[PDB]
Amino acid sequence: SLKIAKVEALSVAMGPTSAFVRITAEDGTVGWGEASPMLGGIASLGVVARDIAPFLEGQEVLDHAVLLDRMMHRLVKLGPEGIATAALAACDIALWDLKGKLLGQPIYKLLGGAWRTRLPCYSSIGGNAARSVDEVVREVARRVEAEQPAAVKIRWDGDRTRCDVDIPGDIAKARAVRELLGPDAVIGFDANNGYSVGGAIRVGRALEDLGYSWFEEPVQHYHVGAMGEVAQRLDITVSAGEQTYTLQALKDLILSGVRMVQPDIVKMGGITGMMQCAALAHAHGVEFVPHQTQPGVGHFANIHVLSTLMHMTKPVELADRWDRGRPVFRNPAEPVDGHFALGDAPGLGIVVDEDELASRATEITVG
Amino acid sequence: SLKIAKVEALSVAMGPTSAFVRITAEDGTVGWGEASPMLGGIASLGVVARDIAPFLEGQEVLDHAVLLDRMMHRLVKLGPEGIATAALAACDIALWDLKGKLLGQPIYKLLGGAWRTRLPCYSSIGGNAARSVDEVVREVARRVEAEQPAAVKIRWDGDRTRCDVDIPGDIAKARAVRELLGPDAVIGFDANNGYSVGGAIRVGRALEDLGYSWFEEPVQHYHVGAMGEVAQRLDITVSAGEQTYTLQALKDLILSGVRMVQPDIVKMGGITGMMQCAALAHAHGVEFVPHQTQPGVGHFANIHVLSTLMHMTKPVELADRWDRGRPVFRNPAEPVDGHFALGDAPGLGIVVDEDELASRATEITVGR
Amino acid sequence: SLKIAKVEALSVAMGPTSAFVRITAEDGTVGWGEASPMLGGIASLGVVARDIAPFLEGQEVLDHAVLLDRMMHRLVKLGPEGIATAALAACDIALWDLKGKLLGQPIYKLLGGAWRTRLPCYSSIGGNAARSVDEVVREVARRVEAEQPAAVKIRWDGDRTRCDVDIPGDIAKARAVRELLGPDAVIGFDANNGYSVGGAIRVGRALEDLGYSWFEEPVQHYHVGAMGEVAQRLDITVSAGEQTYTLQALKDLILSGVRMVQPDIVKMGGITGMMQCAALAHAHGVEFVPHQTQPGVGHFANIHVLSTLMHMTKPVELADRWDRGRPVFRNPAEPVDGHFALGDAPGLGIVVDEDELASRATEITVG
Amino acid sequence: SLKIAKVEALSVAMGPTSAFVRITAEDGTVGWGEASPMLGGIASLGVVARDIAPFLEGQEVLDHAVLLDRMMHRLVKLGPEGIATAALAACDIALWDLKGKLLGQPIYKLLGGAWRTRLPCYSSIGGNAARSVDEVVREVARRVEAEQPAAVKIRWDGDRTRCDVDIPGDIAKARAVRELLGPDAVIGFDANNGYSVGGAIRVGRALEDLGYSWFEEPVQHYHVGAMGEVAQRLDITVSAGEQTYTLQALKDLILSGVRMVQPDIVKMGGITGMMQCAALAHAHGVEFVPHQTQPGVGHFANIHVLSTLMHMTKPVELADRWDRGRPVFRNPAEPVDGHFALGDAPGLGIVVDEDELASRATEITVGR
Ligand SMILES: [Ca+2]
Ligand SMILES: [Ca+2]
Ligand SMILES: [Ca+2]
Ligand SMILES: [Ca+2]
Ligand SMILES: [Ca+2]
Ligand SMILES: [Ca+2]
Ligand SMILES: [Ca+2]
Ligand SMILES: [Ca+2]
Ligand SMILES: [Ca+2]
Ligand SMILES: [Ca+2]
Ligand SMILES: [Ca+2]
Ligand SMILES: [Ca+2]
Ligand SMILES: [Cl-]
């Protein structure tokens, strides 16, 4: 029985900062986890340091599901969504990494097999609310040349205190990207919560005219009713879930009318949680298309899960500035011929440059 | 890594025949699975032999989920409910046994650990449609004495071509068993599809009056709309799912109104599928209380899954003539202090007597 | 009172293998049944041999409905869907054949009359996922010339472990078949479960643009909710049911939102069951358009039932390689001027070459 | 006009630690807010210090609603349920205190006036899962004697990893407390998420038999569909909302079937947010009965809002160990003749002992 000796919560400067969890077992082997670095992930890290670490230390790696579910019911009044679920997700991923090393198996081999070990990417391109038409086109062309993606998603990342800011301008941007990519290109559009119901419908119809494949988070994530209503009113596939943090809330998103869900493995659930979400998606007949923006640990957890997904429909997300995986990681997310290559090393198979890490890492400690 | 060398479909005389799948890996290690022995499980074993074995042999043990999902989609036009899903469940269990033996762990330790390793049981007591009141009472007394269960479920096992056969008699039986067990005892009533909607409600109300805790399969299982309607109209917890064989059908059962679901690990899914069922149950806030009537391989697969269920609300089912686990098995289901004790042997932890097995087993092969 | 002397379960090499049931009455007259030959129908045949045959032997032909309903409640834990319902369907059809011969009447004469004895066919053309555009066109033209059908259906028969494989390619194939057939041609599109909800909607709209009449099984058959949702969201008629095996499940398909149902007479119900399905369809106001892929016994059972259908809307299915009806059958499904001619011989009116049968038949027996 | 000079996040030892926000304006006036002290409120205070303070400092006190709505949308990917919403609630309360001090008015007089300035209380009595029957009874007797409340609520505070733990025992406890208090007493039962759907119904019916007035959080809060289903299936008023942290989630809770909602002013919204919640409650015709367990700042914010509620149907919650309000506060929650007396001091009207505070307080700063 392999025991957890130590749990460390680490804020790490990259390439912006990331939030990692390093769990050292009693035998000296090491597991890596990642929490969504929202405002640096500092809050999630504190929670790991103050609440999760003292509980997990002395306990057994293979009890990971029971340990973390119990931890979540202990942290439930912390939300738990967002900060607590990222903290838990991070620890889940670190324990799976440790589990894979203890058992001598890559994670997908512990999960019942991969349908594929080469997974198509899609270029996820943010910051388009602030760009001119021509800057949007330039950035798309620049990333498409470098990544050879199977699809492209243009995200707005606008100011969520404002609604329906520039509908004609957003449509003009989507038009110009369609003209750039040609008529057969698979294109997604991420509104980042930019629209009212009426505004989302107006944009969706224009996206339908331009042949777009999906329409991501058209309304505020807290209007679940409206999200599903827009989903059911439009032909273009409305997608949401990256700001959904529980299995039950995911269930409710589906019931609202969403047919493509996107929970994130470092925002919630970790490997265990995400496998549960995939089963729920398959039970209801909805597409499962995870949100993932981190080039190292999160990406590896993401692709282990996705290799197990039978009815994979869209490609793996490749977000902006993935080059920031270096130099902390030696093998971070990097597409070859438009695909991610999943290897067979035990655990995650993430390779960490330990001396670069330490020079860039700051431990978050009880306080 | 490790390859599947050989898959055998085995009809085995017990104690009535059971239907087992033995999978041998290329290093000679052996995994055991079981299909629900409906009409002997012969049809399911046939499907294992003709369709599943030739595909599985030469493949990777650890690829169990991909392999069996692929196999289900090849076998889809066989139903696949019942025969086919039981056949895939048997293989899934066998591969998990192997997986656990290869990896050096009990199944529950591959599933993230256990909430408990001592699981309370309930006495599942059938054939009460054909019994008189005193015979019902005598049998409940007998088994409660032997098993000290946490709950009792009396099942009817009536003739499904007939409806609303003896409502007053059924009620008097429920009443007699309440008098016997006392005001505090947890009692369930399994109609085994015996009632119409109206008959179900009438009986349900009478069960509520007697403090019964759940009401199992009040109507024909194929009336999913009615099953959920009855569940939402009553106070007593209506349960169903033993004759539900896919994840999606489980979701439909839940959407219809059912709040206690009972899929069976040797009828569908095996370990992989049941863990997905458990997750769907947890997503929708419904009780997960599996059906299980086999004392050996099926029982063991069942308790591994149930050890990992956080919000277990009802005990482990312990069905009639569980004594038949011997002599084929050396450690089959056996309650001590009203509990099943989960152990930590690699894989299932089930121990087979090869000698007894060889003398009891008929291989189902291609061309029988 | 005519008694059942013998029930035989027969695996038969055709023209692939079929699964027949031969019931011999005590007077020596013979009835023929067919079970859907899924993986040869071997499993259904075993079930007939082990479970159904010993029960039916010694019993009376005219008790067919009571006998088989009782048999289904005895076999219910076998599913009963798929394997058991095909086994039961086969025996139902053989008993109706025997019933028609005993009474001296064609089956449609026992069912209350035919609206027509000449029934239009439609060419049902599979294997289009694996073909190039040009091979799809070639095969359609080849079959349309030979069959003079009232409609054409192109089926994909793709790999159900994969979802949304080639949407632009499938649409290109549907376009080219529309161009080949002209603007007035009645064309159906069988997705064989190839799409997600979003994918099915995308394809359906393109099929709507190309004037297609129906859209068959767009999503996995086990996503009944999604099937009906797509049905209600689209203008093109979504159809399903060939993978529905009970009256109650059919009822649920209808409630989900499907408005065209396609149960198969050798997969389920037989003549008795299908007559019940037709009544349910008529009660709910949905089209009844049975799936049928077998050129002999199944086809004859199908057309007896369909001659009774008042509001027939689509033609009779004529699937690939119907020529395999010969030489076991002397009068198998063969269109003349685009129509099937239903004759007045008692029972099914199927004519069996008994010596070809025996040379090609293998009995499945208790074991 | 008046600017925010400084925001401090304070962890304060009471009587168990509370989590307070002190906002000082540029004229040296001071406003007090409180975040729900979940696991000490340390995470919420961290968020105040790192994320909210640098933004608020230099801004206008009277811009509270715009400022905190803007702040919530910047902090949205922290949840924001729980930690973040409690942190924004604390700031909202502090700014209202300041607003009231600046304007020379009590908060309720800025909110349009009060229906009443004497508010009845109810005794909220926790930890009854772990108690024996006699211990439950003794504690209800003790507090009812000391507090003379208008109602009593007995809460369970059970282990949320466990479900349907002791239904008969729970019922016997409810029964014993009814015998103690008499036929007329208003009694609520707080399951603290202890039951499945079926277990909730079973308990609900038993509570209806005993004339209980409401049934609080029968199921896991994350099962919103089940919570509403249970609410619509029972007669006894099912209440929830204490673990609901946004306005929209409150609306979903109401749509699910719940007709009594209980958001908490120091968990979410603060004064601004709660008044919006009250309005949504009034739009949908549901009871508005906030959760509140803190004796000082939170209590005061709570009674200001509740003074303005036209159709108040249930009393003000008075939770365990309210005595811990002293010595940090000079006038914390204290029932007289079963009532809380709302006064007319500018702002909250809460009086802090700076001396005790300084000796009890740890500032949570950037880099601790
Ligand atoms: Ca241990
Ligand atoms: Ca430590
Ligand atoms: Ca996004
Ligand atoms: Ca072999
Ligand atoms: Ca049962
Ligand atoms: Ca042995
Ligand atoms: Ca007779
Ligand atoms: Ca015979
Ligand atoms: Ca078809
Ligand atoms: Ca400052
Ligand atoms: Ca409470
Ligand atoms: Ca003072
Ligand atoms: Cl009622």
Look at residue D13 and give its three-state secondary structure.
strand
Residue in C42, C51, C255 nearest the CB of B39? C51
Look at residue C339 and give its three-state secondary structure.
strand
The span from the CA of A240 to the CA of D307, in Å, is 40
- H helices within chain D, ranges in order? 42-47, 53-56, 64-74, 83-103, 107-110, 133-147, 167-181, 197-209, 224-233, 247-256, 270-284, 297-306, 354-360
C105-367 sits in which CATH class?
A: alpha beta
How would you label C330-342 residue by residue, b for 16+ Cβ within 10 Å and e otherwise? ebbbbbeebbbeb
Q: Is the dihedral of CA C273, C275, C276, C277 positive or negative?
A: positive
- Say whether C198 and A214 touch across the interface (CB within 8 A): yes
Interface test with A, best of B3, B63, B308 (most A CBs within 10 A): B63
Residues of C in contact with A213 (CB under 8 A): 198, 202
Q: Are C39 and B50 in contact (CB under 8 A)?
A: yes
Per the structure block, which two tokens stand in for B167? 């409502």
Of D265, D353, D342, the C-alpha closest to D107 is D342
**A175: closest CA of chain C, how far (Å):** 19
The span from the CA of A282 to the CA of A290, in Å, is 14
Q: What is the CA radius of gyration of chain A?
A: 20
Looking at the DSSP bridge assignments, the partners of residue D35 are D19
What count of other Cβ atoms lies within 10 Å of the Cβ of residue C261? 25
Q: How far is the CA of A346 from the centre of ligand 1 (A)?
A: 23
E strand or H helix at C282, and its extent? Answer: helix C270-284
CATH architecture of A1-104: 2-Layer Sandwich (3.30)
Q: Which CATH number fits domain D105-368: 2.10.210.10, 1.10.150.20, 3.10.180.10, 3.20.20.120?
A: 3.20.20.120
Q: How far is the CA of C228 from the centre of ligand 9 (A)?
A: 16
Taking phi first (over 0 means left), then psi (-120 to 50 degrees means alpha), and beta for anything else, what does residue B104 get?
left
Q: What are phi and psi of D8, to 5 degrees?
A: -120, 135
Q: Are C199 and C226 in contact (CB under 8 A)?
A: no
* Residue that is written with structure tokens 């059906």 in the block: B291
Per the structure block, which two tokens stand in for C336? 């003349």
How would you label C308-329 residue by residue, b for 16+ Cβ within 10 Å and e otherwise? bbeebebbbbbbbebebbbebb
In chain B, the residue whose alpha carbon lies closest to the alpha carbon of D201 is: B235
What count of other Cβ atoms lies within 10 Å of the Cβ of residue A350? 22
What count of other Cβ atoms lies within 10 Å of the Cβ of residue B145? 9
CB pairs under 8 A between A and D: 101
The span from the CA of C95 to the CA of C67, in Å, is 10
Q: What is the DSSP string of B185-227?
A: --EEEE-TT---HHHHHHHHHHHHHTT-SEEE--S-TT-HHHH
Q: What interhelical angle do C270-284 and C64-75 show, nearest 10?
A: 90
Look at residue D306 and give its three-state secondary structure.
helix
E strand or H helix at B43, and its extent? Answer: helix B42-47
Look at residue D93 and give its three-state secondary structure.
helix
Q: Are C41 and C86 in contact (CB under 8 A)?
A: yes
Q: What are phi and psi of D281, to 5 degrees?
A: -60, -45
The span from the CA of D216 to the CA of C233, in Å, is 40
Assess whether the previous peptide bond of B327 is cis (omega < 30° from 0). Answer: yes
* Residue that is written with structure tokens 């709570």 in the block: D302
Look at residue B287 and give its three-state secondary structure.
strand
**D289: closest CA of chain B, how far (Å):** 25
* Residue that is written with structure tokens 């079963």 in the block: D338
Q: Are B305 and B290 in contact (CB under 8 A)?
A: yes
Pairing relationship of beta strands C4-13 and B214-216 according to DSSP bridges? unpaired
Q: How far apart are the first and last CA of chain C?
A: 31
Q: What are phi and psi of A55, to 5 degrees?
A: -80, -40
Q: How far is the CA of D166 from the centre of ligand 11 (A)?
A: 19
Please tell me whether A209 is known to bind a ligand. no
Length of chain B: 368
CA–chain centroid gap for D337, Å, is: 22
In chain B, the residue whose alpha carbon lies closest to the alpha carbon of D222 is: B285
The span from the CA of D261 to the CA of D243, in Å, is 10
The span from the CA of A84 to the CA of A76, in Å, is 8
Of B245, B240, B244, B246, the C-alpha closest to B261 is B240
Per the structure block, which two tokens stand in for C337? 């001027």
Interface test with B, best of A91, A109, A244 (most B CBs within 10 A): A109
Q: Do the domains spanning A1-104 and A105-367 agree at the CATH topology level?
A: no
Q: How far is the CA of A4 from the centre of ligand 1 (A)?
A: 12
Written in H, E and C, the secondary structure of A248-316 is: HHHHHHHHHCCCEECCECCCCCHHHHHHHHHHHHHHHCCEECCECCCCCHHHHHHHHHHHCCCCCCCCE
Between the alpha carbon of residue C100 and those of residues C8, C93, C350, the distances in Å are 19, 11, 12
Q: Which residues is chain A interrupted after (C–N above 2.5 Å)?
A: 15
Per the structure block, which two tokens stand in for D27? 């004229």
Chains D and C share 3 or more Cβ pairs within 8 Å: no
Residue in C162, C198, C205 nearest the CB of A259? C198
The span from the CA of D20 to the CA of D363, in Å, is 10
Between the alpha carbon of residue D158 and those of residues D164, D195, D227, the distances in Å are 10, 10, 18
How would you label C39-78 residue by residue, b for 16+ Cβ within 10 Å and e otherwise? bbbbbbbbbbbbbbbebbeebbbeebeebbeebbbbbbbb
- Say whether A235 and C202 touch across the interface (CB within 8 A): yes
Residue in C198, C222, C223 nearest the CB of A260? C198
**A289: closest CA of chain C, how far (Å):** 12
- Say whether B184 and D205 touch across the interface (CB within 8 A): no
Q: Which residue numbers of A have CB closer than 8 Å to B's CBs?
A: 60, 62-67, 69, 103, 105, 109-115, 247-248, 250-251, 272, 275-276, 279-280, 282-285, 308, 310
Q: Are A63 and A97 in contact (CB under 8 A)?
A: no
Chains D and A share 3 or more Cβ pairs within 8 Å: yes
Closest ligand, as measured to the CA of C289: 9
Q: Are C39 and C77 in contact (CB under 8 A)?
A: no
Helices and strands per DSSP (H, E), number in chain C: 13, 13
E strand or H helix at A175, and its extent? Answer: helix A167-181
Q: What are phi and psi of D49, to 5 degrees?
A: -65, -50
- Dihedral in degrees, nearest 10, Cα atoms D221, D223, D224, D226: -120
The span from the CA of A320 to the CA of A324, in Å, is 9
The span from the CA of C279 to the CA of C300, in Å, is 20
Please tell me whether D57 is known to bind a ligand. yes
**D282: closest CA of chain A, how far (Å):** 20
Look at residue C222 and give its three-state secondary structure.
coil
Looking at the DSSP bridge assignments, the partners of residue A261 are A240, A288
* Residue that is written with structure tokens 């919640």 in the block: D277
Q: What is the DSSP string of A212-239?
A: -SEEE--S-TT-HHHHHHHHHH-SSEEE
- H helices within C76-190, ranges in order? 83-103, 107-110, 133-147, 167-181
Per the structure block, which two tokens stand in for D336? 């007289």
- Say whether C164 and A313 touch across the interface (CB within 8 A): yes
**B282: closest CA of chain D, how far (Å):** 9
Please tell me whether D242 is known to bind a ligand. yes
E strand or H helix at B138, and its extent? Answer: helix B133-147
Q: Is the dihedral of CA D247, D251, D252, D256 positive or negative?
A: positive
Assess whether the previous peptide bond of A106 is cis (omega < 30° from 0). Answer: no
The span from the CA of D246 to the CA of D175, in Å, is 36
- Say whether B245 and C79 touch across the interface (CB within 8 A): yes
Looking at the DSSP bridge assignments, the partners of residue D21 are D9, D33
CA–chain centroid gap for A55, Å, is: 26
Instruction: Work out the angle at residue B74's Cα, subtended by the Cα atoms of residues B70 and B77, and round it to the nearest 5 degrees.
Output: 135
Per the structure block, which two tokens stand in for D208? 């209806």
Method of elucidation: X-ray
Residues whose CB falls within 8 Å of the CB of residue B82, separated by 6 or more in sequence, listed in order? B38, B245, B267, C77, C78, C79, C80, C81, C82, C83, C84
The span from the CA of A154 to the CA of A134, in Å, is 14
Instruction: Work out the angle at residue B81's Cα, subtended by the Cα atoms of residues B80 and B84, and round it to the nearest 5 degrees.
Output: 55
Between the alpha carbon of residue B151 and those of residues B125, B142, D355, the distances in Å are 11, 14, 60
- Domains of chain C, by residue range, sit at 1-104, 105-367
The span from the CA of D39 to the CA of D16, in Å, is 10
Q: Are D194 and D158 in contact (CB under 8 A)?
A: yes
- Say whether B276 and A284 touch across the interface (CB within 8 A): no
Q: Are A178 and A187 in contact (CB under 8 A)?
A: yes
Closest ligand, as measured to the CA of B106: 1
Residues of D in contact with B214 (CB under 8 A): 198
Pairing relationship of beta strands B316-318 and B339-341 according to DSSP bridges? unpaired
* Residue that is written with structure tokens 């919204």 in the block: D269
Residue in B39, B77, B255 nearest the CB of C78? B39
Q: Are C186 and C155 in contact (CB under 8 A)?
A: no
Residue positions forming the annotated binding site of B for Ca(2+):
57, 60, 190, 216, 242, 352, 354
- Say whether C201 and A235 touch across the interface (CB within 8 A): yes
